[PDB]
Amino acid sequence: MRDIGLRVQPPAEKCDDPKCPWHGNLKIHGRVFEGIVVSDKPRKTVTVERQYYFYLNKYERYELRRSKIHAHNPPCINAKVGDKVLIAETRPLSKTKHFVVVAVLERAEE
Amino acid sequence: TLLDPLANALSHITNSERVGKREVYIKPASKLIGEVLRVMQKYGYIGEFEFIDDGRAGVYRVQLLGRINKAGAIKPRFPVKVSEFEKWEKRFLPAFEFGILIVSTSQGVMSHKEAIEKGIGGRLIAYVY
Amino acid sequence: KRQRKKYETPPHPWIKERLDRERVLMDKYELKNKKELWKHETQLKNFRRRARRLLAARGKQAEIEREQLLARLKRLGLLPEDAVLDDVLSLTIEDILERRLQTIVYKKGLARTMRQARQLIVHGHIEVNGQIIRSPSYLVLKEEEDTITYARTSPFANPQHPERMMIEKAKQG
Amino acid sequence: ARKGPKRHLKRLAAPTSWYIERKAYKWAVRPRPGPHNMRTSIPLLYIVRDYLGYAKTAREARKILNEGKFLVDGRVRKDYKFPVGIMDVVSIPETGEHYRVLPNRIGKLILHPISEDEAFIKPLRIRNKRMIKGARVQLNFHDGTNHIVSIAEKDNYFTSYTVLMKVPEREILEVLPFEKGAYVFVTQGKNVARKGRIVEIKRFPMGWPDVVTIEDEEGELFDTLKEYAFVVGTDKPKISLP
Amino acid sequence: AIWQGRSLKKPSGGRIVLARKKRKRELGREPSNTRVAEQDKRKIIRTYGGNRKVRLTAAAYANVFDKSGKGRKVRIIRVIENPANRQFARRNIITKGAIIETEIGKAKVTSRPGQDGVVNAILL
Amino acid sequence: GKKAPNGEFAGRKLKLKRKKFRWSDIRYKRRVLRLKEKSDPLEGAPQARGIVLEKIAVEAKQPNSGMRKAVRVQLIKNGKVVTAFCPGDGAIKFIDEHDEVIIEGIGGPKGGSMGDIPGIRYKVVKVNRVSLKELVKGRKEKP
């Protein structure tokens, strides 16, 4: 148990990677969002989706937009599709990976 | 397929009025509808009203007093803050304070003038004058 | 960034009603251009614009701006000291036309004619508050109304300038 | 395109803390890097020309600075681009005049005159603490100055405490601590040029600093950030504060 | 040049047109390719902002370390295995993480000759 | 039925609908696709300089009868050939073969034809850098 600074319990598994914020050298600084896993096929990778409503100044109605974000999935938690997860800005890691999972708020089966 | 109780209710009221009957029986009765019916009755636009347990959805019985020029339901529930009511009031009223607007606010659905006095915005639901 | 004209052209240049009304007005006050009348109407209209925005305005800034408006209106000599916002709408163009410097100086008897007052103003023969003004379109505050006086160096300042005799006879005549 | 470091600063872009007419001319003094930030400082040249009216033309002002007649924090400075920042003491011995730099309620800086006896004390916020080789403790202040002290004296200081610094000889006089109920003068924000007392410290995670709540003299409560809170006394201000 | 910059392709795939020329602050430098020899040959390199960095083009000695923490300066005979590439071990190339054979025996390199200019390793 | 959609969460398709029908008009589509700027013989220029070749007279469309004088000109800018109407009385007398001229649009409805002359889109204003109207008045002299 090492502190990440975010109010969430730590993953039970202790992995040996250098890229687990709970079990590695990397840090966290920047926003925290929440979202859902939509795809997990690439290794140690996750595409988090986020829906939200946007306002049209000329039409005074709402546009529901879907936003995706790539992020890294450490093995300790092993995020899968259908799961509500918490995401934090992180050091640049790949061509596009710039966010990391910190926890799984609620898995798919629930 | 019936989809909005309130709009059918207020339309039914106006369509009774332009004839000018005495008693109206709003078949789609709901708690929010009853709150609304209280609102303008507190400015006596209607006489008494009563709830009738029909076993299915309730029915509201209402007397008219012949004082409703037009009573429409703002359907797209525009949310509005306090400071700009005059634009929306001008959107749905003939003259300065010539009638009311019904706003759903954090405390409970009721009229707009007090909502300015209490200084709380909300979501427009109906207008009438 | 470009500076805008200070006046608003009429939406139609040949309405008989408005044309003849303006004609009567500039006959009364002997202005040089309808542009001038339009400018005066413009500031009239902007006073009213402020009044109308404020009359429906709620908020501390609104009240402060309202008091500023009332105070400036009073200071111009266009309203009574007990004036209230409601009356400002009733302000007419003629209320401002009277407050024109040229109309004031003619109304002081110091001129036989409106255009003679104009000639004096351009020629500087008039002074206000110890400073000379050459513009007959300037709007005079109430507080200065008592100080409107002949410019010292002006030949008209002396009580012997032959035109001033005719001025005095017109005043008494 | 631009290719590195600037050397100019157009008047129109100048910081909002400077009582400088902006459309009279186009070119101003770019401050060189120094103790205080761009947002909380002004060149001394403008202090001489505007805020004191001693010099009408910048050349003459520079001449007077060349004479070295000016004592900021008990040090003469000839640099007519010196950032003279917040809570500095400007002293003119030729005139026996002493002011302290302090912001306005609006967010602009003024020279509040102070007594001569106060002119030697300068309170410095403790920005951060660090360990340097030899196990020595170095404290970095809000104004960028640095003070070295022993390992034993490390706990005498903590970040966000105020040290009354004796600028003429660099001697530490007193350490006002940050605890509930101190007297604090605000530095930046909407609550600028406010002075009050502390009731609560809001521990904010997720990248957001400590929001202290300040209770004014009249009892009104407001909030500001930790870094904007500058302690000046345990219960009353130890310096003349408008 | 050696340009360590934008990928010409978007993540989705749409090819990206360039809109400006490359920048000297953005270019890289050649590979060191540290090799086994009888003497240490090194090149100092002026770098971005006036810094310096020394680079081993030929290496003769290594600092091996015991798990206890005691270090031995020794010679380097040959490289056993280079996980970074298969061509490197064949050509006595020296890189961090490589398995090397010295007089003491098997060591794993825990330092980068390219940037450090010395080679440190752990006895296995 | 009721005009649709109007709901809280339907703004997107309402916007799409209006963008689709924004193609229904003519002026907006003409502006966005810049049809004139690829059909324009004047290349957006209010006035253009040309060289005249030939004098041509035409008959007013019926019931209006009258012989209108005009000229055909090749544009110095690009080289297209276009006819410009000569307004005034005795105008053609001043103009002759091989004359430098300056020409603008006729100011018809949408810039089109005017009144009793067919298709003519332009009128001369200056000939050899001397303005037509004063020569029509005769105050000045052609070079």
Add this chain to the structure above:
Amino acid sequence: EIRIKEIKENKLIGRKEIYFEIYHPGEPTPSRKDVKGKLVAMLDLNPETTVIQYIRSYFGSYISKGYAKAYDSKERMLYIEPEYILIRDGLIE
């Protein structure tokens, strides 16, 4: 006539700074020599050390603003006050 609105003392520069107003009703704006030789009287100043910078003649006014220096030594004005105004006052050819 001349009426002084203000006299202040630049002690860092050892000089007196004088703001004043000149009353000239109906008569042209005065020459520099006369205003200098007449202001020199009523503050007990040396002519050489005193310099007048600007006499602003107002439009449509019989009052002209005036603003002038008064140093304490010959060397300081040469060192500080730039040559042009010395030429205007004649203190340098």
Add this chain to the structure above:
RNA sequence: AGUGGUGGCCACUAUUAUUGGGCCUAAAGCGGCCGUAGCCGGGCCCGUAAGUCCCUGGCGAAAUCCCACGGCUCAACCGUGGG
């Protein structure tokens, strides 16, 4: 001391229409039906606070804009102060 001619842009225009347009006879409902995403959806009880709303800190830099005051003769412009 400007006015006229031409060209392009907003209003005129509810001839672009959410406020705020029509589709039997004036151009405009497809021949009919099924249904995916999308959009809109009966009432009552418990929870939530994502939206929605009220209060509160930082921030959205200047110049331009509105207002009072001061300087330039007034104005425009500039400064001080409030939005």
Add this chain to the structure above:
RNA sequence: GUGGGGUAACGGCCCACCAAGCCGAAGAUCGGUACGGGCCGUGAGAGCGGGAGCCCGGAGAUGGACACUGAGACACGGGUCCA
């Protein structure tokens, strides 16, 4: 993804290997068009249209391409080739 390289610096920026991903009908890909903002013109306003003139940020030195000096450069008034 693994392991390295070079960089001021993290990273497919590169390289060796291991996998089959990732984007697209809430329109990729491709083309047409075009520096972005503070703003400005018009309108009672909803809105419509535009980014020339000042300030901020971005990009360029006929086109391309490549170095040295250097804290800072591929450097309008420094250098090399090609057209």
